[PDB]
Amino acid sequence: ALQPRRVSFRGEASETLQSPGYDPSRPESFFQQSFQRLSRLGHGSYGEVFKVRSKEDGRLYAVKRSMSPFRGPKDRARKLAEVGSHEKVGQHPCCVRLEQAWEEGGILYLQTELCGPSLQQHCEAWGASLPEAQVWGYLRDTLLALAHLHSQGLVHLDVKPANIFLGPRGRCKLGDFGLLVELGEVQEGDPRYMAPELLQGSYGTAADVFSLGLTILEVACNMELPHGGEGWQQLRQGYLPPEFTAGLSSELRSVLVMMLEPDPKLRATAEALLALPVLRQ
Numbered sequence: 001a002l003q004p005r006r007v008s009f010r011g012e013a014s015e016t017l018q019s020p021g022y023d024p025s026r027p028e029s030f031f032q033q034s035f036q037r038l039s040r041l042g043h044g045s046y047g048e049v050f051k052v053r054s055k056e057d058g059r060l061y062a063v064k065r066s067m068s069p070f071r072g073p074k075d076r077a078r079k080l081a082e083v084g085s086h087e088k089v090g091q092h093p094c095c096v097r098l099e100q101a102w103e104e105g106g107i108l109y110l111q112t113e114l115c116g117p118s119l120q121q122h123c124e125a126w127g128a129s130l131p132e133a134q135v136w137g138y139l140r141d142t143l144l145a146l147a148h149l150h151s152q153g154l155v156h157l158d159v160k161p162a163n164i165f166l167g168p169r170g171r172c173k174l175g176d177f178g179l180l181v182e183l184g185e186v187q188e189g190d191p192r193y194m195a196p197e198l199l200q201g202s203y204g205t206a207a208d209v210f211s212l213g214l215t216i217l218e219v220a221c222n223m224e225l226p227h228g229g230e231g232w233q234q235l236r237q238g239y240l241p242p243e244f245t246a247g248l249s250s251e252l253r254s255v256l257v258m259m260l261e262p263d264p265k266l267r268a269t270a271e272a273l274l275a276l277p278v279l280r281q
């Protein structure tokens with residue numbers, strides 16, 4: 001019968017192909033044999049994400065698998081690129097850790113640490129504007145991740161609440177590196193969080209800082225970001241939406257204006273922001 005194949009990457013927790021509980025004679029997949037499923041964390045075009053307990057160590061992980069088998073070599077390399085992107089990011093407390101990746105029957109599996117609810121789910125639960133206290137914590141933690149990615153010439157290109165996951169004691173970790181590219185390949189991002197210079201084909205680390213600014217503006221004001229049209233242009237002229245920017249502290253607005261600077265040459269970097277007095281330790 002079919003058998004899994006480890007998708008090799010520097011920094012994996014186990015260079016062994018399988019766990020002792022896996023019997024290659026059974027018709028069940030390595031996923032079904034080496035993991036007790038628990039619940040579905042999310043689904044979509046990207047596949048499905050399950051909360052699992054390993055039938056090997058009983059530890060809690062999150063496993064993502066692709067929906068359909070590989071369409072071809074380009075489709076396979078596109079899906080496998082997310083594993084390589086995790087390998088380039090490496091280990092950082094503010095980045096979702098990749099444990100191991102493999103493929104079986106054309107399906108790609110990625111086993112990561114189990115994180116908390118996404119920043120999107122957390123806002124849906126509270127159903128209102130997140131208090132500014134929590135907003136600074138998530139902003140600092142995400143800037144820490146971006147500063148780590150950008151220091152290696154990596155640009156995430158998909159910073160949004162659905163890709164930020166809550167950690168213990170109010171922390172969070174940047175995630176979903178399926179669109180990350182290394183400067184020196186690029187896929188369609190979300191237009192709601194798209195930096196304005198990406199339409200001009202200017203890809204750089206500054207694009208992530210803009211996406212995080214809209215991410216903060218979305219969670220702190222409980223507003224829906226437009227996909228296009230006039231509302232999309234207004235969030236990219238340098239100023240803030242006066243309607244929703246009310247109730248925000250002047251300290252937060254000034255940081256937002258810096259991140260939302262239209263010209264990427266003049267836009268602050270992740271390290272520049274983390275050195276501001278409002279983002280102390």
Ligand SMILES: COc1ccnc2c(-c3ccc(F)c4n[nH]cc34)c(N)c(=O)[nH]c12
Pocket residue numbers: 041042049062063064096110111112113114115116117118121165174175176177
């Ligand atoms: C609603 O919650 C989630 C939705 C989607 N995905 C996850 C998820 C995860 C799984 C597999 C990966 F390769 C990941 N990369 N970045 C994050 C990844 C987790 N770890 C996690 O806790 N919740 C997730």
